[PDB]
Amino acid sequence: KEDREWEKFKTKHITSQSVADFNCNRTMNDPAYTPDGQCKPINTFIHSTTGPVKEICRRATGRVNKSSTQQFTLTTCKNPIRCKYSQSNTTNFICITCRDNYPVHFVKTGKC
Ligand code: NA
Secondary structure, three states: OHHHHHHHHHHHHEEOOOOOOOOHHHHOOOHHHOOOOOOOOEEEEEEOOHHHHHHHHOOOOOEEEEEOOOOEEEEEEEEEEOOEEEEEEEEEOEEEEEEOOEEEEEEEEOOO
């Protein structure tokens, strides 16, 4: 169900918060943004409106990994000590799995 996979991707990997306001310790432990479970060893959050992320797949057909053509601001929450994280940010391209027009999986930072 590609729309629901997209919803899971949005929740897990796209943040509506600014780089400054984003808080790894809150979000990584908040069920609302962690549909695979809380306190994971790593996660990459894309600071973007959903449209531009979705348009990574604009020319995608079937199931295929696509690189973004532009860079995104990214927060990495990593290396938890009792679910308390190192937090850092950078800009980079991203590599996602598209199912048709829908991002359904975060593959890697950088190009595919
Ligand atoms: Na960069």
